[PDB]
Write a protein that binds this DNA or RNA. Structure first.
Ligand SMILES: [Mg+2]
Ligand SMILES: [Mg+2]
Ligand SMILES: [Mg+2]
Ligand SMILES: [Mg+2]
Ligand SMILES: [Mg+2]
Ligand SMILES: [Mg+2]
Ligand SMILES: [Mg+2]
Ligand SMILES: [Mg+2]
Ligand SMILES: [Mg+2]
Ligand SMILES: [Mg+2]
Ligand SMILES: [Mg+2]
Ligand SMILES: [Mg+2]
Ligand SMILES: [Mg+2]
Ligand SMILES: [Mg+2]
Ligand SMILES: [Mg+2]
Ligand SMILES: [Mg+2]
Ligand SMILES: [Mg+2]
Ligand SMILES: [Mg+2]
Ligand SMILES: [Mg+2]
Ligand SMILES: [Mg+2]
Ligand SMILES: [Mg+2]
Ligand SMILES: [Mg+2]
Ligand SMILES: [Mg+2]
Ligand SMILES: [Mg+2]
Ligand SMILES: [Mg+2]
Ligand SMILES: [Mg+2]
Ligand SMILES: [Mg+2]
Ligand SMILES: [Mg+2]
Ligand SMILES: [Mg+2]
Ligand SMILES: [Mg+2]
Ligand SMILES: [Mg+2]
Ligand SMILES: [Mg+2]
Ligand SMILES: [Mg+2]
Ligand SMILES: [Mg+2]
Ligand SMILES: [Mg+2]
Ligand SMILES: [Mg+2]
Ligand SMILES: [Mg+2]
Ligand SMILES: [Mg+2]
Ligand SMILES: [Mg+2]
Ligand SMILES: [Mg+2]
Ligand SMILES: [Mg+2]
Ligand SMILES: [Mg+2]
Ligand SMILES: [Mg+2]
Ligand SMILES: [Mg+2]
Ligand SMILES: [Zn+2]
Lengths: 43, 95, 144, 129
RNA sequence: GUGGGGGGACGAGCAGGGGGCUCCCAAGGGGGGUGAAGUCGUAACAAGGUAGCCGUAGGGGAACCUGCGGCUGGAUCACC
RNA sequence: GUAGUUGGCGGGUUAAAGGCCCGCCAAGCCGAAGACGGGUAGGGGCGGUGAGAGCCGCGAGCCCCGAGAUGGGCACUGAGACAAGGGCCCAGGCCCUACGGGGUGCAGCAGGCGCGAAUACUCCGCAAUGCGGGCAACCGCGACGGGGCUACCCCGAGUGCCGGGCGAAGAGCCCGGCUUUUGCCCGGUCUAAAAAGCCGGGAGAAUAAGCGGGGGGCAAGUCUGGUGUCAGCCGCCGCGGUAAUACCAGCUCCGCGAGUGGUCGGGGUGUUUACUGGGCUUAAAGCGCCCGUAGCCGGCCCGGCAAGUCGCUCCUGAAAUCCCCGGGCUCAACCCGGGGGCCGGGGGCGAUACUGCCGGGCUAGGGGGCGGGAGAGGCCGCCGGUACUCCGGGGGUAGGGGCGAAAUCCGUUAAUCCCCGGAGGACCACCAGUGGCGAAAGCGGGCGGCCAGAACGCGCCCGACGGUGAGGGGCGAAAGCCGGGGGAGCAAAGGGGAUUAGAUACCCCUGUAGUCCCGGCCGUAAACGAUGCGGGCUAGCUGUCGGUCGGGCUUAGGGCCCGGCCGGUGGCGAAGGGAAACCGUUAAGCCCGCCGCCUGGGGAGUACGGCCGCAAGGCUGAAACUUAAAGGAAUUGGCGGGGGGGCACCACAAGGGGUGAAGCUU
């Protein structure tokens, strides 16, 4: 059948190279709606 | 899908048919759904020059009917596979 | 082939009985009325249950797909029944160990049956030793 | 076996109107049929109504004016109240200004407009539009 | 106020059978069904190479075969 | 099913009626309008969902009624209990003890263990609301009130505003200014006291955003890296096997936001439960056919009633909840006040069209008749027709029979073929038909007898007597079974001869049950029009059958032709219907009734139970589990050991030269 096995669990996740990610804080609802109005309705 | 409105046999308002036996066969079907082709038939065809009007030699002809099931009726060419439009054409079966 | 059937003005009870007779042709109504879920379900109608992991197993995906989906065998505490529970997430099986208490939960899929290409698996692991496997996989928590 | 002369007559009228005939003959008949035809003629859906005295109960010859879009007898004969007239109105008729229900009340067979005017109820009979 | 013997209604409990409805356990089977394609044939689909199918009975490694009656959902909507 | 069970009579007991209990007497009582039996469940106000009908119970919390206090019983006191923090006994636990005894069961408010996916403080007060006691003042109250904890439900807000720059118009950073909700500190008020709330005061941008997702459904990336049908995604469809928009990460964008997600259950979805409002020719689905009980549905007119129905009114349907309106909390959520409903019960007064009841009268549906015809309708008896097999005799030799070819086989004790006789079993050729009869199954020679059921014609009789029909029945091919008779032909099983790789098949020879008759059982079928039964309406044209009427002719006949009606039986085809094939006055159209059946596939006509059967078996008839389709009609193609036509020295025919064998080149 398939060439998979239980010994190969997590292979791709363990093998992918770790790239550090920037810190980020999401917006509050009012600021998000402000941003969407600014970027979509406006220019 | 239902081929033909006849059910394949013009049986009439009845429940069961007396049914017959096929010639060269025996698969056959009832009185309807069978072929009953008629031929003139006479022994020794075109000897009427050398017989009949020589000696006294009075011959006889006998009209003869042959009954065939669907398989033999197709087999001896008495029935073809006509198209859908021509399936409802009323033709005699070459006597 | 004509005129429903009991249409009379004083045919109300007969119409009600006739309509109630044909509700038993519905699989859902019959199952709900006869309690087949609470008789034959390993979860016994609960949205989740507890179990102890016995062995790690790998099921083969259905024909067009090629993969070994990794599950475990879990024995439920409340009934003792042993059922195969899919362990989701990449590398999720490595957070599972034998004799580990796990939270068994319905895999989803149509009508509570098996999921897309996994044949005959109805459950999946949500918690491992009291900690959610999602949090463990994401690193927000560590398995105790 | 014949059961409802009213539904029989109404469906005969509908069939004749579908075929675009000028007159429809109605046999057997009763006073309910006569009053229903009277209400229809009053509202213009049915033209002249001639009685024929055959020995077997009488006949009604009704002239059709091309005015019916759909006719039929509401069966069962549901008892309806004055406050309940409006939902049956919306149930059987198109538009709030088009068509009429026919009702049999203790003051006689009338339209749903006349029933709402009199503030009464009764038994629904048919619809016209 | 009582203490004995007896009778009475109510009536637990413990002894037991009787029955039922349930639920498990069992050496061994018994008909089945799902995989992935491993063997044997080729039964169905084309007049599928013996037209097909239905009920029934017998027979056979097996698909199935044969007898009887039926159907066309036939390969015939068609004698003279 | 019931046997104190149902009722009566006389008593006892009770506060009081009652088989509540007792003595006698009778056989009664319940049930297919579903007894009894099993299962589930406290009932209601009410709640969720849907536009609504409706479906569901989250019918937990709040209010009303019920029952219980570890299981099962029985009593004291008292107006009231057979009494949750009172009593006695059995059971089954547990705690203390000085062994003699005693106490105890949190389903009270906290709290602990256990179970489970799943849970709050061993807190404060009798100040509000009430209650028991008291003349009262007052007292008590784990009721109640207050806070605590907890992503309980609803409501209102914050996590900054303004301008400039960089950034991209974004995020973010920086610069200049503004504000202080909020968070923090203080005072008053508030609070039973606290906490919180509100008023006021202080510093300060300062203290405060996540969850899910971006291949389609479905808003958001063919951007970058990694992996390479592995790892993983995936409610469904589907990705991943080197260039992944779907997996792992980065960047970036999207949805909602103090929430956002996963799994469950309900509703929507769903016209997949269909009253509104589905379907049953072929997709799932008309019982094989008919008789009929309950039920449901039922012709016309007149008179009476006023039961259903309709109108108004009254007594009601607790409160909360729900809808509308006004008002009060900063608006809000919420609270207060008024109207409505809360789908119902009953009383009074009215109406009579419709339904029902009662009475009288009809003939339109139904039944019963009379007349001349039609019919393979049935049962019974007698008879025939050829064919056939066999037997006996006569003729005449040597083959016959069979097949693609044979062979087995029959024959020299004379076959096949011919003739003369006899016996036996089946069938009823042509005529003969989408012809007839019958409910279906089914029925095909003639004559006779006994029955049955229709159509037609009628100024005949009765007067709605009708439809359908769960349950209940009766009839019901073939095969098969039981017992008896018969047995010509055919022929499962079986034997043999062939064919084949095999041939336990297809071909040939043979052959037994069986096929036929009598009595019974079986009770099934592609028992089919795959089309339930009854009635009405809706263009026509055409073949044929029966009756009848008008005209014409006459094989002068019971005959033929044309036209009309009624009733069958086929074809084409209006309107209309349908997914389409197609149906289309013989509807699958437009309607009025009643019955049966269907609710994706497989599992599976399976298992269990019951009933029926001599048996085979039959009827009835699941679930677990598994699956994303199975399926209908039609279109294009492809193919066929189906049909038809056309063509070709990369086909054949008529020819010529060759290659295939030897040596050598390749
Ligand atoms: Mg038949
Ligand atoms: Mg699936
Ligand atoms: Mg084959
Ligand atoms: Mg074949
Ligand atoms: Mg055989
Ligand atoms: Mg044989
Ligand atoms: Mg008394
Ligand atoms: Mg009693
Ligand atoms: Mg809706
Ligand atoms: Mg509570
Ligand atoms: Mg007790
Ligand atoms: Mg007590
Ligand atoms: Mg307790
Ligand atoms: Mg407690
Ligand atoms: Mg107080
Ligand atoms: Mg909020
Ligand atoms: Mg810029
Ligand atoms: Mg304070
Ligand atoms: Mg995220
Ligand atoms: Mg991504
Ligand atoms: Mg999009
Ligand atoms: Mg996705
Ligand atoms: Mg449907
Ligand atoms: Mg079908
Ligand atoms: Mg039928
Ligand atoms: Mg059946
Ligand atoms: Mg059948
Ligand atoms: Mg009344
Ligand atoms: Mg109010
Ligand atoms: Mg109420
Ligand atoms: Mg109320
Ligand atoms: Mg009947
Ligand atoms: Mg029946
Ligand atoms: Mg037989
Ligand atoms: Mg024999
Ligand atoms: Mg033979
Ligand atoms: Mg059928
Ligand atoms: Mg259809
Ligand atoms: Mg047609
Ligand atoms: Mg069945
Ligand atoms: Mg059984
Ligand atoms: Mg083609
Ligand atoms: Mg040549
Ligand atoms: Mg050579
Ligand atoms: Zn033949």
């Amino acid at each position: 059948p398939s060439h998979g096995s239980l010994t190969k669990a997590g292979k791709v996740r363990n093998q992918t190279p770790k790239i550090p990610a920037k810190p980020r804080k999401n917006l509050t609802p009012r600021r998000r709606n402000i941003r969407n109005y600014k970027r979509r309705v406006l220019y | 899908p239902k081929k033909r409105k006849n059910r394949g046999r013009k049986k009439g308002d009845k429940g069961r048919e007396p049914y017959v036996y096929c010639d060269n066969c025996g698969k056959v079907v009832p009185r309807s759904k069978a072929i009953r082709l008629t031929v003139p038939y006479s022994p020794v065809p075109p000897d009427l020059a050398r017989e009949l009007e020589k000696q006294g030699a009075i011959i006889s002809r006998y009209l003869v009917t042959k009954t065939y099931c669907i398989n033999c009726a197709v087999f001896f060419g008495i029935i073809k596979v006509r198209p859908r439009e021509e399936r409802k054409k009323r033709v005699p079966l070459q006597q | 082939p004509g005129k429903k059937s009991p249409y009379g003005l004083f045919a109300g009870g007969k119409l009600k009985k006739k309509r109630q007779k044909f509700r038993w042709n519905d699989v859902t109504y019959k199952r709900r009325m006869l309690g087949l879920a609470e008789k034959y379900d390993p979860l016994e109608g609960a949205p989740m249950a507890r179990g102890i992991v016995l062995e790690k197993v790998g099921v083969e995906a259905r024909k067009p797909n090629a993969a070994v989906r990794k599950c475990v065998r879990v024995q439920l505490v409340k009934n003792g029944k042993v059922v195969t529970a899919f362990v989701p997430y990449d590398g999720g099986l490595n957070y599972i160990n034998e004799h580990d208490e796990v939270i068994i939960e319905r895999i989803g899929g149509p009508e509570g049956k098996s999921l897309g290409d996994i044949p005959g698996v109805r459950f999946k692991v949500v918690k491992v030793n009291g900690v959610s496997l999602w949090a463990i996989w994401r690193g927000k928590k560590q398995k105790p | 076996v014949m059961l409802d002369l009213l539904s029989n007559a109404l469906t005969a009228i509908k069939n004749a109107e579908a075929m675009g005939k000028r007159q429809v003959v109605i046999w057997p008949v009763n006073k309910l049929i006569y009053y229903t035809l009277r209400v229809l003629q009053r509202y213009g859906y049915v033209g002249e109504i001639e009685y024929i005295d055959d020995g077997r109960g009488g006949k009604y010859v009704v002239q059709l004016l091309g005015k019916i879009n759909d006719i039929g007898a509401i069966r069962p004969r549901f008892p309806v109240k004055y406050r309940e007239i409006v939902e049956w109105e919306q149930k059987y008729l198109p538009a709030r200004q088009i068509g009429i229900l026919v009702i049999s009340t203790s003051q006689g067979v009338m339209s749903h407009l006349e029933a709402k005017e009199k503030k009464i109820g009764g038994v629904l009979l048919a619809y016209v539009y």
